[PDB]
Amino acid sequence: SKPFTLPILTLGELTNSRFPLPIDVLYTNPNESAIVQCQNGRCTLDGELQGTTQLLPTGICAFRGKVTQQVQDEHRGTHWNMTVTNLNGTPFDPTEDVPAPLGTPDFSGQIYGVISQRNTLPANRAHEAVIATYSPKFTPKLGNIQFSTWETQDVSSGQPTKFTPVGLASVDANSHFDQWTLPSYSGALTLNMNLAPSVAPVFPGECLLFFRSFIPLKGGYGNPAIDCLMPQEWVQHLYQESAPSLSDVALVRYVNPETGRTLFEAKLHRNGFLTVARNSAGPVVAPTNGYFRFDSWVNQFYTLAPM
Amino acid sequence: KPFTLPILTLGELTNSRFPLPIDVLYTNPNESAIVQCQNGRCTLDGELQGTTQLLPTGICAFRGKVTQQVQDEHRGTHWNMTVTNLNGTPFDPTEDVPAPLGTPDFSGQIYGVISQRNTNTVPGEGNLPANRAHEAVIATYSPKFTPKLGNIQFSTWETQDVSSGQPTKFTPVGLASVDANSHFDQWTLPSYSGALTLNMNLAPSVAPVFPGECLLFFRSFIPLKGGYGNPAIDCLMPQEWVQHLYQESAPSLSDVALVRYVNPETGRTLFEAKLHRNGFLTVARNSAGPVVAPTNGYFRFDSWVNQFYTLAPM
Numbered sequence: 001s002k003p004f005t006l007p008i009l010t011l012g013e014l015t016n017s018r019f020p021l022p023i024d025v026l027y028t029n030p031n032e033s034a035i036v037q038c039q040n041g042r043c044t045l046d047g048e049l050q051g052t053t054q055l056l057p058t059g060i061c062a063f064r065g066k067v068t069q070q071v072q073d074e075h076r077g078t079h080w081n082m083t084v085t086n087l088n089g090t091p092f093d094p095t096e097d098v099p100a101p102l103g104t105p106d107f108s109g110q111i112y113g114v115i116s117q118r119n120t121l122p123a124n125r126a127h128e129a130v131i132a133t134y135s136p137k138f139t140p141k142l143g144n145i146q147f148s149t150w151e152t153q154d155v156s157s158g159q160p161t162k163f164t165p166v167g168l169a170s171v172d173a174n175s176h177f178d179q180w181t182l183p184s185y186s187g188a189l190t191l192n193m194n195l196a197p198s199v200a201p202v203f204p205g206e207c208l209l210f211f212r213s214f215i216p217l218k219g220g221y222g223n224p225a226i227d228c229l230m231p232q233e234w235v236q237h238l239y240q241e242s243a244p245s246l247s248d249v250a251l252v253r254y255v256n257p258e259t260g261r262t263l264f265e266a267k268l269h270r271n272g273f274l275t276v277a278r279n280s281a282g283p284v285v286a287p288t289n290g291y292f293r294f295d296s297w298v299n300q301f302y303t304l305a306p307m
Numbered sequence: 308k309p310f311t312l313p314i315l316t317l318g319e320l321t322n323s324r325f326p327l328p329i330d331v332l333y334t335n336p337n338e339s340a341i342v343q344c345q346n347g348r349c350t351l352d353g354e355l356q357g358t359t360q361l362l363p364t365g366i367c368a369f370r371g372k373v374t375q376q377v378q379d380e381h382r383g384t385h386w387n388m389t390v391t392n393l394n395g396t397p398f399d400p401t402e403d404v405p406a407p408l409g410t411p412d413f414s415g416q417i418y419g420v421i422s423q424r425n426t427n428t429v430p431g432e433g434n435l436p437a438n439r440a441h442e443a444v445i446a447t448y449s450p451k452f453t454p455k456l457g458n459i460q461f462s463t464w465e466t467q468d469v470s471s472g473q474p475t476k477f478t479p480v481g482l483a484s485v486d487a488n489s490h491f492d493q494w495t496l497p498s499y500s501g502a503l504t505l506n507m508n509l510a511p512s513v514a515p516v517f518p519g520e521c522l523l524f525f526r527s528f529i530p531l532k533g534g535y536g537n538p539a540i541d542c543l544m545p546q547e548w549v550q551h552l553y554q555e556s557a558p559s560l561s562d563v564a565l566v567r568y569v570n571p572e573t574g575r576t577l578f579e580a581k582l583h584r585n586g587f588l589t590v591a592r593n594s595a596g597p598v599v600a601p602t603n604g605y606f607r608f609d610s611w612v613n614q615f616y617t618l619a620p621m
């Protein structure tokens with residue numbers, strides 16, 4: 001049986017699997033009221049990608065496709081309908097057993113980025129753009145979405161189009177940012193399908209442990225963050241290794257390699273998420289050289305040393 | 308410890324010199340420039356070189372602080388920003404690196420977004436900081452591009468809404484232009500400490516040694532803000548190879564690893580290549596252009612070979 005391993009990467013060598021951001025801090029929030037069911041950064045410990053998760057760091061919250069036409073919308077700006085393909089350019093098959101094209105954003109909000117086009121030497125253009133994932137026009141599972149520009153005219157129809165995500169447009173009330181609210185991938189009155197399962201601690205005194213990144217803002221007030229269950233490099237590692245899971249729960253230790261000492265231990269669950277025994281919210285303050293190391297397979301009854 | 312490569316198709320790889328997916332494998336035997344890029348540089352036993360670092364988000368990115376608006380003759384509004392290491396710690400110019408890790412390694416007008424999140428918070432706004440972001444261009448050929456000195460200059464279309472003394476991030480997106488006046492040349496290094504200074508601590512140049520061999524690149528097409536063109540960025544190894552080699556640190560048993568590009572469906576070898584100790588590929592090919600290969604293809608380590616080994620022609 002191929003031994004289970006995690007990569008040896010400090011926090012400063014990890015990136016977020018739900019938005020293209022470095023990992024800033026480890027983070028807990030025991031009093032979280034929302035169901036945690038993100039769809040990017042989802043991978044079982046034996047290497048099965050789930051939800052909308054794919055391997056490319058450049059694919060996370062990215063889109064590829066073609067503008068069909070300018071469209072009208074209640075949102076501020078100029079609006080454009082875009083058909084979307086798979087990120088590799090092949091047509092998206094809405095009957096595939098996935099919630100949405102892989103890489104599709106997995107949260108409610110106004111995602112800010114840049115739309116660029118290279119015509120079929122070719123002419124080019126790029127503009128700032130916003131994709132409102134809560135919008136009735138956000139229907140990636142049907143093969144098309146809508147973005148808005150401040151630019152009023154220079155977006156070409158029928159030309160290859162890329163969305164590069166950068167951050168959020170706003171986190172004010174009207175912008176509906178909620179990292180745990182899933183988009184309706186096929187539109188408002190339709191049920192999402194093929195979702196990666198929700199995650200939660202089962203043991204008393206335990207809470208989820210997140211890899212947190214702070215996400216840029218185009219304007220307004222706020223310090224928004226995106227929490228992922230595992231960094232993108234862990235997704236990539238687990239997929240490569242495909243090591244069989246010998247129980248439902250791996251014990252892992254966060255180690256200081258300089259001193260060799262364990263800072264804390266955590267449960268790494270089969271479906272691909274961490275829990276710790278902690279009763280507070282906020283960052284985990286840990287030396288920069290720290291990283292998780294697999295210790296042993298345990299079970300759901302194992303009692304974690306309190307953080 | 309046995310040497311290995313990850314098992315990743317082209318469609319599962321990203322560029323180590325700009326945040327782009329890999330589009331095609333590519334050769335250009337008649338290239339006249341010295342190939343000495345500084346990102347995507349890693350020896351086969353896992354030593355990062357040049358300005359190479361591990362984060363896909365760090366490639367051609369900057370972290371720092373805007374000091375002030377400044378004057379420049381070129382069109383737009385110009386701003387000076389000090390730069391730190393990507394992790395926020397101060398950049399130490401005496402470090403044995405060409406420039407802060409992640410610094411762009413080519414001449415051009417790099418287009419992206421500058422964003423700011425103020426240090427000070429506002430009581431009337433729930434003790435939250437103010438934010439702004441705008442499109443920006445960094446001319447890496449400019450005398451004001453001095454990342455090794457700890458500061459660079461960027462231009463914006465926005466004329467006023469960039470704040471002094473506030474934490475600033477540059478997220479790269481593509482190039483502003485590739486017209487003659489924009490000086491795009493992927494093999495021309497920036498002058499990291501400014502005009503007329505010698506770059507130091509560089510990853511070495513790479514080149515084939517055997518007759519009939521040429522470099523093999525992982526090619527990505529880079530977006531443009533405007534104008535005509537189809538610019539590409541060629542890297543020696545994808546970022547995932549850098550990350551893998553770094554992790555594994557398998558000792559190199561010769562100067563050259565023989566690798567085979569394989570079709571896993573048929574099990575057949577599509578072609579073979581030399582993977583050199585310093586971290587680059589050569590093939591036996593006498594043409595320039597894309598390598599047309601099945602989508603399911605990837606490189607597999609075969610064996611360490613010696614100075615006399617001859618590659619089968621592609």
Ligand SMILES: C[C@@H]1O[C@@H](O[C@H]2[C@H](O[C@H]3[C@H](O)[C@@H](O)[C@@H](O)O[C@@H]3CO)O[C@H](CO)[C@H](O)[C@@H]2O)[C@@H](O)[C@H](O)[C@@H]1O
Nearest residue numbers: 169170171172175218219220221436437438439440468
């Ligand atoms: C706090 C300031 O944000 C920007 O001010 C611009 C302003 O931003 C608003 C957003 O558009 C809106 O979604 C919400 O977040 O309120 C923000 C203001 O609090 O937008 C107007 C246009 O309507 C102007 O563009 C303002 O410049 C930023 O530009 C400022 O530097 C401040 O950080």
